[PDB]
Write a protein that binds this ligand. Structure first.
Ligand code: FAD
Ligand code: CTC
Length: 366
């Protein structure tokens, strides 16, 4: 390689891709939407499985650092009334597939690992266009740049996939509402104490509640349900409008959980989406281009596949792009994509499948 790569998106999947390339010498860049490095990343915690997510960290020398920040966490399962199954973390296993890390923390660990100015902040890729030998990358109100390989690694809603595949995202039919509570122990004591330093999942009448009670000192919860045919007709801008819907749905549940709803300051309602690995991707492409993470195989969050498969993506493509066991870039990508279409479709089938089971009328996590 006498060339350069451009990864669109500073996600955990993108930044990883960046490290694994950079430590092999390959000249690389990460164009990130976010306005600066201390931008707050909304969402839960992530857990890197020992088979996969962890392996990539290993190969970047960051596995250790990952544990250092990660927190092993037990899981309580609950009725609407009260407790059902507790499960602590047995010390034989607290260093594996469990350790829940804060999304920002992971990025901090990743940004450290990269040379300075590897990530160009406030760069919102609006358009991608292939020239003679280089792609031309267009960013909203910033100068364009060019590169010899673009790796799309920029979210399940990537607006810029066209050169790789005509496939488009699809809503699965469920919906998720997600929120944070700061100082959970004061603002939802009832709920905090039901968690008891442990994650919490409870299900009742095709309504699922999940919670982590300790995400860097804030509780993050999720509510889930098949999308109402009524929908759409809840305003995620008016908190009163969201609260009123959740209370109608959650009327049955204990006083403790209703506190949680009534306390949340603001909600983030996004539908469950899939970007299916259905057709093979375009086999004639103007220049070399590929996709990793959710830009590749966006799938329902109901299985902890997601970041893990996506990190595997980096591990594989990065190896391919460095070992010198391929004759052209085309071939190295075209090979990574074969493998991903395999464990990828697996991960998706699994997630879809878990999705179906949970919202089935009468479900218990036991
Ligand atoms: C509610 C919820 C819960 C989830 N829970 C889990 C889980 O528990 N375990 C798991 O493995 N997965 C989970 N997922 C999926 C998980 O978040 C993703 O797999 C992973 O975070 C996505 O990694 P990524 O870097 O490929 O995507 P992203 O993290 O979305 O990274 C893309 C990056 O590109 C940036 N970007 C977007 N557009 C542009 C652009 N135009 N130009 C430049 N940059 C851009 C974004 O800002 C972002 O920084 C969950 C998803 C949701 C919605
Ligand atoms: C966003 N939503 C889907 C869930 C959610 O709201 C969570 C949260 N911390 O509040 C999660 O734990 C989740 O985001 C989350 O992390 C889950 C998770 O890790 C997981 C894995 O890895 C394997 C099997 C299962 Cl059944 C799960 C499971 C159900 O615990 C999911 C739940 C989701």
């Amino acid at each position: 390689s006498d060339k350069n790569v451009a990864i669109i998106g500073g996600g955990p999947v993108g930044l990883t891709m960046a490290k694994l390339l950079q430590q092999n010498g390959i000249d690389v860049s990460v164009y990130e939407r976010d306005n600066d490095r201390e931008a707050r990343i909304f969402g839960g915690t992530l857990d890197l499985h020992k088979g996969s997510g962890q392996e990539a960290m290993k190969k970047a020398g960051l596995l250790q650092t990952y544990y250092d920040l990660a927190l092993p966490m037990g899981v309580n399962i609950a009725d609407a009334a009260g407790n059902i199954l507790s499960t602590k973390n047995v010390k034989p296993e607290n260093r594996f597939d469990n350790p829940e890390i804060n999304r920002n923390d992971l990025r901090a660990i990743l940004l450290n690992s990269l040379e300075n100015d590897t990530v160009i902040w406030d760069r919102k890729l609006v358009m991608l266009e292939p020239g003679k030998k280089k792609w031309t990358l267009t960013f909203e109100n910033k100068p364009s740049e060019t590169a010899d390989l673009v790796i799309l690694a920029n979210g399940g809603m990537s607006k810029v996939r066209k050169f790789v595949t005509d496939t488009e995202v699809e809503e699965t039919g469920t919906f998720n509402i997600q929120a944070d509570i700061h100082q959970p122990e004061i603002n939802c004591p009832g709920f905090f104490q039901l968690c008891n330093g442990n994650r919490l999942m409870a299900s009742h009448q095709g309504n699922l509640l999940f919670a982590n009670p300790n995400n860097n000192g804030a509780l993050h919860f999720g509510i889930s349900f098949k999308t109402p045919d009524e929908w759409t007709q809840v305003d995620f801008q008016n908190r009163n409008s969201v609260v009123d819907f959740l209370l109608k749905e959650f009327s049955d549940w204990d006083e403790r959980y209703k506190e949680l709803i009534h306390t949340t300051l603001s909600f983030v309602g996004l539908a469950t989406r899939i970007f299916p690995l259905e057709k093979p991707w375009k086999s004639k492409r103007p220049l070399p281009i590929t996709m990793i993470g959710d830009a590749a195989h966006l799938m329902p969050p109901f299985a902890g596949q997601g970041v893990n498969s996506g990190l595997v993506d980096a591990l594989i493509l990065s190896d391919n792009l460095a070992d010198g066991k391929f004759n052209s870039i085309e071939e190295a990508v075209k090979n990574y994509e074969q493998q991903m279409f395999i464990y990828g479709k697996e991960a998706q089938e699994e997630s879809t499948q878990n999705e179906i089971e949970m919202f089935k009328p009468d479900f218990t996590f036991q």
